[PDB]
Design a protein around this ligand. Sequence first.
Ligand SMILES: CN1CCN([C@H]2CC[C@H](n3cc(-c4ccc(Oc5ccccc5)cc4)c4c(N)ncnc43)CC2)CC1
Ligand SMILES: [Cl-]
Length: 448
Amino acid sequence: TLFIALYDYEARTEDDLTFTKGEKFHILNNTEGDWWEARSLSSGKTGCIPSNYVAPVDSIQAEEWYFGKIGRKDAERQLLSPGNPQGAFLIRESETTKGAYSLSIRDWDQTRGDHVKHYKIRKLDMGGYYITTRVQFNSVQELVQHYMEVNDGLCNLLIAPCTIMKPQTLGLAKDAWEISRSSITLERRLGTGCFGDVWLGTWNGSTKVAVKTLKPGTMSPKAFLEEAQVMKLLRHDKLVQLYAVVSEEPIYIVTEFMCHGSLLDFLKNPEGQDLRLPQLVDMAAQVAEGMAYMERMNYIHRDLRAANILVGERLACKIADFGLARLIKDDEYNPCQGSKFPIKWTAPEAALFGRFTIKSDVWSFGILLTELITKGRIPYPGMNKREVLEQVEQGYHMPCPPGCPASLYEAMEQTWRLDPEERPTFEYLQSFLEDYFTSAEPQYEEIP
Ligand SMILES: CN1CCN([C@H]2CC[C@H](n3cc(-c4ccc(Oc5ccccc5)cc4)c4c(N)ncnc43)CC2)CC1
Ligand SMILES: [Cl-]
């Protein structure tokens, strides 16, 4: 019933609390999962707080080294980022054993180079958590405290908890999705598109946000609102976080700010040009993970391409601009009826017969792979959009791009099969891209 703050937080409205890491609370109202009413034990004052910033006191969720339901691959991405020394570690839930845990730790050897080792934290039915049966503990907390004090047979001491990215609230404020335009201040234009602008700005003069603004006449405000109600339900690490919307024209879509812009631009600037093939395949795997989430939700992107992937802190990739292409209205200059779609990225049955499915998104993902492996090259170079439609209808697809491995191109060709049911699932593509290089590793470290 008693909670403790994991991070600092500054109030944004007049209803929420300002608190410091280590401050404790009573929780009074949890009707909204994202924001809880709470009373501070330090000040005695009552206000709402972001629920993901607190954890039960003394619980494992309040430990700095506990990362909850993070994935193995995400744990590796986090541990192998700068600021984590050798011996940086985290504890997570097991992906392959219900009720078990995993200890992930950064290590180095001559064969695997700089890598992460994973240890299975199992639980005896009679009692006791253990990495090795020789030593047993009442709780995972005690296990960690022990392996932080002495290296009892691991690859290293548990030296420091893994560093975490800047935490973010789920929504700008309690019970807030549709906001007035006056609450947004557009400060710096980030770019201009055919459907509108993107700006960096603030909400309530306090919270840094990005705002995509749509030109009037782009889409029905009511249709936009009904689709945003569904988008609001999508929640995943590899999708860009929607904060709020403004429905009156011009429409605002307010999201978190991604400090490196689009993947397409990032791959062309010097930092992206220095990228090696493993990093490129890992970004592809991140996009495939987000799209596999959308596949589980049977939510169709319709506009999957490198310009609609955003790159943020730690080069994390997030999927943007999903769902909304369906609602884009017609004009007198484009013969495309009803739903608009990016010509060079759209599957033949979707472009010609309007059958948008997750399999047409798979085709799109193959095109995005060509974009990504070449570090920004235009698809079907030399061909205009009409020629592309005509040729992909006849079964033409792109040849192997320069510098693309044979297995990656075989995957692309699989995504470009004319029968949509013969294309792989995003689940398969995620598994393939994650294990593309780490093919011979043993899953968990054998340790007696
Ligand atoms: C030459 N370049 C100049 C920059 N151009 C682009 C300009 C906008 C950039 N950009 C775009 C976005 C962005 C913002 C909101 C948005 O709305 C939706 C999100 C999910 C689903 C539906 C809608 C979609 C995208 C962006 C960002 N959030 N944070 C930081 N940067 C951002 C990405 C690059 C691309 C061409
Ligand atoms: Cl935030």
